[PDB]
């Protein structure tokens, strides 16, 4: 890919493939020019070290990169653990994060959610109403009504969030109680409020700890966030029958 400004940003494989096709291309020549067997016998010995620097580089002299001083990154150093797999053991859309605060007026099953965030996660839903209620003729004309923050969307956004459970989850998620759904309530500010009883499940002090929030999109995914994962179902920790919502 060409970077911005003229430089290119090549992967570290176009440095290794050029080194096999070059050496293999020469060894095609020495068998037509008929060199002695001190050289061509040194060619195959030199090619075979370049095919094996491609598969798994490092079990040899560690053919470090040119024009730089770190070792190249071969194919078998791409699946090899980064502590985990290359596939799914998945960064995720419809997310956010902010500084949690207290908000001790909430019920047990609801968490705050700032207007400036909820208007950004629930965007494709809001586009549905503004073209369903006829307020916007076409979708391009709805993208310019949400950018202005017209006073109509603040009343359409509230009906999109009628019973739509969101998923708060803290960073080092130890046990299954580290992820719980909540029914949002639109506040003003930029801190995700959170009922004080539940802050001992996440193990969250209120001194700067942030918390991602997700959004279950489909129709089976906001029932699993209400039957199984809701915050009023988990009052007994799974490790043992003792409660987990003790007033702290």
């Amino acid at each position: 890919v060409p970077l911005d400004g003229g430089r290119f940003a090549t992967s570290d494989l176009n440095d290794l493939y050029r080194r096999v096709i070059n050496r293999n291309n020469r060894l095609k020549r020495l068998l037509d020019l008929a060199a002695p067997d001190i050289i061509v016998r040194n060619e195959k010995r030199m090619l075979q070290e370049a095919v094996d620097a491609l598969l798994d580089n490092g079990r040899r002299g560690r053919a470090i990169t040119g024009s730089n001083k770190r070792p190249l990154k071969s194919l078998a150093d791409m699946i090899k653990g980064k502590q985990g797999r290359f596939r799914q053991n998945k960064r995720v859309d419809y997310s956010g994060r902010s500084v949690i605060t207290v908000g001790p007026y909430l019920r047990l099953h609801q968490c705050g959610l700032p207007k400036k965030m909820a208007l950004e996660l629930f965007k494709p839903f809001i586009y549905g109403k503004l073209e369903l209620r006829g307020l916007a003729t076409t979708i391009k004309a709805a993208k310019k009504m949400v950018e202005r923050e017209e006073a109509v969307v603040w009343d359409i956004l509230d009906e999109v969030i009628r019973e739509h459970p969101v998923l708060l989850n803290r960073a080092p998620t130890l046990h299954r109680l580290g992820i719980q759904a909540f029914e949002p309530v639109l506040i003003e500010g930029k801190a995700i409020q959170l009922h004080p009883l539940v802050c001992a499940a996440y193990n969250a002090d209120f001194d700067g700890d942030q918390m991602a929030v997700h959004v279950p999109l489909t129709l089976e995914a906001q029932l699993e966030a209400r039957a199984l994962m809701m915050s009023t179902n988990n009052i007994l920790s799974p490790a043992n029958g003792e409660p987990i919502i003790v007033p702290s």
């Binding site: 040194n42 010995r45 030199m46 070290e49 040899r60 002299g61």
Partner: peptide
């Protein structure tokens, strides 16, 4: 005499 040498440049000169 092959003292576990690996890199060819050792093997070329030798």
């Amino acid at each position: 005499e092959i003292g576990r040498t690996t890199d060819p440049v050792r093997m070329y000169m030798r």
